[PDB]
Point group: D2
């Protein structure tokens, strides 16, 4: 089968031909219908060899949807042909976090060598993929696969980040979304669906500010040195109840600390090596919590799928073939994908 | 009346003679029965003149209990002689935060010039004190005033900090308390009363580790370079669900980041100028939130008083006269008060 | 001044001429700009003399907006001319519930003889009205008074009912609204603004089912014997996550028990003498909680006002003069007001 | 193997000899070390034939602990000899409730024919038992099995009931526990461990009031017509923040409605056919919620085990052999077991 793989440190990924896998006991083989590209793939491919823990070669793609092609020995709960999304942050399934579906926060996965598809286990950027267990599949019914693939991370990750503090986001609240990319353009829409927060989008690119308004942001403002003042002009001196930073550069985290309200929240979702919030007296308002969330929970993925099925999420995509995979990653690097890139095998 | 006041920048506080105040409309005059000394008073007195916002002169003391001496015009809900604790973090009473009793997070207090007793308004370290409004008094009944004074901050502040994340502290959880001083020795006892957390206390001083065990800590660890490893030996590689840092030095915040669990919490309660948690990917576990909480809420103070009335709080105190006020602050500076210092006028 | 009063048991209310009141210390005199009629007024007027606790005569109206006309002695925080909504369920202000703004659940109001405007204290159906305290006023700015009056109860009560279980109403959930009257037509809109619940409205009257669709209900079902089956056809055998019963007749409560989901909720908001849910094994699903909520909290009223200011609430009204007050109550009795009746003095 | 079974409608359970089962793919065979008796077993055995859905014959026992004896095909995550408690309210594992561990509230179990051990599937009152899946086992380490068996229901059910409203139970709150039996005597102890609530116990039997005080109740009062006034004398006119009714008779539910506070809670945990709270205006205070909870969640069982491991739960038991199973059920019927009855297969 055709697949897109990261094969050597510092190089671009390449299209390869590798055997179509066979599902062992408990496993499910999916025929992949859509595979999302994520900026985390770029972060992973830019890690030095000392840090990189994905293994070589690695089939990329941690945003996967498909149809059940083959059931491994003893697998029940799905039939051949069922359309399914892959729950990505695989955990042990047995610890206190996993028992609540919070496999993203599994305390045993490292020790047991459990790694996610697309970063240690083979991903969805291939014609077929193996899923380890039935509990890592969620039905999507007749959802269009191209718009469904991003739900698994571009949807799930912002959904989790927002869910952590949703009780803060009542009528009268403001939520700032920094970075209107794959994650951010879905995060705006989640905020509008599950809260009455006023949503203010922030991006470097004027076309992405237009995208923000298209998907329901109440205002959209230019990122950089003037952003904090511009957000404060919109909120008055109260600031923003919550800031969801999907960039996570030092400059954006600084903007976040300069606009967050007393008893508010900053979610540092975007990943930039070394960047961090500085949480201390006189550097941040009283009561303003900060976290780096990771991916999301099993029940959250089901909720994201439910939002998509109800028509609440308009996922902006561009479609690529497997052969165009490497080219698509270059597009993502240069910032020329409006929304989410999706490979269709 | 006799009072203890901060009268010039960089100097020690002094005992003074100043007029006994008279309550205006809405105000209550208390005869003070006990006034707690807090390390925040030392922080305030060490601020350079540019930063210091308490006004000069300032009657110290933001931990106050007393008996109602005189009712100002139109005050109902209290009789002369009623024993009461003073709710300290005064707010506007009208904003969304204040309507929930969360006057510690009042968004209008700065703009309206509303300042707490002992830092902008006259404190409790005097024979009498004015309280601005009846909603800032909580009845204590027959509670001993000396042990009750610390409830207003040494009790309230840890109570608030713990309350922010109480749902995390289930059976099987661990809570670390760094700094077994006024706040910390009460925080251990709150944790034991309102959660099933295993409590690990951390202090530089072996006698304070003994105090920790006396008030119900399950374990005690010497602070400094070995603390993180020693806490991890006690928790296993999971780490501590929550860390309540009542020191807040860079070294203790670093220890906190090195031991906090995935999806855990660090509460940076203690104040050291410039110290901060560094909340960023690879610098803190996934999902581990961090906050600097401030004081507490009206309903929390009532709950703290209820804990004291139920016998759940053993407040360790040393008593001083008003004339001994300055000497007591020197004792607090040098770390020679075992628990909380309390002035009795 | 002109007012509408209930003056004898079993009779219709009458237009009267009574002195314009003068505000005592702490009180505020409002010039009333709009006064809502509520079906609770009919319930109150139909009570036998043994049960009725409103006093005679009673100025009706517990849904009041106005402009500040006169400040009583010592009142600050409002200026003459300020547009304000009246928080109705007056409490003592000092107990644990009141400290959290939850004066609807005040434990001391009965003992202290504190009664709400329109049921023990004089209501808003008059040219002027007294409010006991500044904390019972919430600013509305330039909101149209006619559409703002209903926010104080038709908005607040459903808002509170929904808020009690809002975490249940995630994507994929269903909320049933029984009774599309004053409260119910606002409840549909709150559900749409603060949750991703699919909303199914239930009413006896086809025109009210049309109103339900006009304000955003996803589906509409005829009430009565077929309603349970019709709701289940829409939800599948899972049933409805939450049922907000704004009728509260035995028949509607029975419908609610027949459609509620496992681990769901029934809020019995509407009042019919003797009607009750029967909460016991085999009579209701496992985990499905039931409550009779009362009015709402101070912070909730602020949130409702915030929803109105953001354009999320389209309040359907019909306007009446004070002279038409009694006629308007007859209209409400017969079910001929489409939404909320509002008296404008 | 020896087992205790319900074999015909209206009859007492009997000791039988039936084959030792073999685990199929995904299943685990446990050697049972302790099996708790629960009053729900009596409720089930008293159902008329039209209502009874447990199947015949039925090996009783939904409170089970054991050691892993045999792993079915493909089972990982447990070794032979591991000491484990059985999570009882089996669900589909795939629905929104099950994904959160809330298999007690599974929306698909009925449709798929998934039934719990001891009520549709074979229970733990036997020398061996099959568990359907590894996710229904929780490790207990070196916990004494006799005191551990009750954690699976006598612990889990009150724990769940309390957990639903734990944020209400702050300092200053009062929690009433009606019925100091298997569930109730553990519920008192959970309340003391996870909240600062003042605990008031209620029972018909003075010896059970003594038991209540022994395990940390702040007060213990006689059930029946005078109980509501006696509880109100202890709380003042505020009433009780929460009432956990582990009897669930109409009389106890009525007591609960008469003492619950405004914005409080009544958890109707005990099962009496036809009994119900009447939730309506003027019949209950404003804001006082009422629910019938069912069993508990996966993460809750882990928390209960953690409480036991920390020394927070003193489980009062009496031990019986498998041969004494039927006699033990008669003891439970007559109210003569002080705490929980536990069968230890030899
Ligand atoms: N926390 C997690 O679990 C997790 C999961 C998935 C992705 N991520 C991270 O989320 C981030 C976003 O991922 P993506 O796939 O949506 O990225 P993307 O490349 O689709 O979008 C990036 C967007 O950010 C904008 N942007 C870049 N720099 C900016 C700045 N300084 N100010 C404002 N806007 C700026 C761009 O203009 C673009 O619109 C990445 O860092 C990725 O690694 C985190
Ligand atoms: N966030 C707020 O709202 C708030 C409110 C009140 C007080 N505070 C602050 O909380 C802190 C504690 O106040 P307090 O009055 O309890 O102080 P205290 O002087 O009574 O206690 C100091 C204690 O900390 C210990 N300690 C000092 N350095 C240490 C280290 N590196 N590691 C471990 N232990 C150490 C000492 O041994 C002593 O036991 C102060 O910084 C104070 O300003 C904050
Ligand atoms: N719990 C509280 O604190 C609180 C507060 C305010 C009002 N209330 C109560 O809420 C209820 C609604 O008040 P309102 O002023 O909105 O009433 P309303 O007269 O404006 O509306 C009643 C609506 O219910 C419909 N209806 C009547 N019987 C029905 C049935 N069997 N099935 C379906 N629909 C039916 C009518 O067609 C109408 O659309 C009243 O009972 C009132 O006393 C309670
Ligand atoms: N909701 C659920 O998921 C669930 C789960 C397990 C058990 N249960 C039920 O909980 C109940 C308790 O089970 P158990 O095994 O602990 O029972 P048990 O037989 O051990 O306890 C009985 C106790 O209740 C007392 N009692 C009886 N009637 C009383 C009354 N009117 N007032 C006060 N006390 C009274 C007895 O004196 C005795 O102390 C049963 O009804 C059982 O079916 C429910
Ligand atoms: Zn990703
Ligand atoms: Zn795990
Ligand atoms: Zn202090
Ligand atoms: Zn305020
Ligand atoms: Zn009303
Ligand atoms: Zn009150
Ligand atoms: Zn049972
Ligand atoms: Zn299920």
């Amino acid at each position: 089968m055709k697949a897109v793989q990261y094969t050597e440190i510092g190089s671009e990924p390449v299209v390869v031909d590798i055997p179509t896998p066979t599902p062992g006991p408990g496993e499910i083989l999916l025929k992949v219908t859509a595979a999302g590209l994520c900026h985390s793939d770029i972060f992973v491919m830019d890690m030095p060899a000392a840090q990189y823990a994905g293994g070589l070669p690695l089939t990329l793609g941690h945003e996967g949807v498909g149809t059940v092609a083959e059931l491994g020995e003893g697998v029940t709960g799905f039939g051949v042909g069922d359309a399914v999304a892959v729950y990505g942050p695989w955990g042990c399934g047995a610890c206190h976090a996993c028992a609540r579906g919070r496999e993203n926060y599994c305390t045993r996965a490292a020790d047991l060598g459990i790694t996610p598809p697309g970063y240690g286990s083979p991903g969805s950027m291939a014609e077929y993929m193996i899923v380890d267990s039935a509990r890592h599949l969620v039905p999507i019914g007749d959802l269009d696969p191209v718009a469904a693939a991003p739900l698994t991370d571009a949807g799930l990750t912002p959904y989790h980040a927002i869910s952590r503090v949703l009780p803060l986001l009542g009528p009268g609240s403001t939520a700032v979304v920094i970075g209107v990319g794959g994650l951010g353009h879905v995060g705006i829409q989640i905020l509008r669906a599950v809260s009455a927060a006023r949503v203010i989008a922030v991006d470097l690119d004027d076309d992405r500010l237009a995208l923000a308004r298209e998907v329901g942001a109440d205002a959209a403002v230019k990122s950089g040195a003037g952003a904090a003042d511009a957000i404060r002009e919109l909120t008055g001196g109260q600031g923003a109840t919550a800031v969801f930073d999907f960039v996570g550069a030092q400059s954006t985290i600084d903007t976040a600390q300069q606009v967050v309200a007393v008893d508010g929240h900053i979610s540092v979702v975007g990943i930039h090596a070394g960047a961090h919030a500085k949480v201390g007296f006189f550097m941040i308002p009283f009561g303003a919590s900060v976290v780096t969330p990771y991916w999301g929970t099993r029940s959250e993925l089901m909720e994201v799928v439910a939002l998509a099925r109800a028509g609440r999420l308009d996922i902006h995509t561009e479609t690529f073939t497997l052969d165009e995979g490497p080219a698509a990653y270059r597009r993502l690097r240069e910032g020329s994908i409006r929304g989410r890139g999706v490979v269709v095998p």
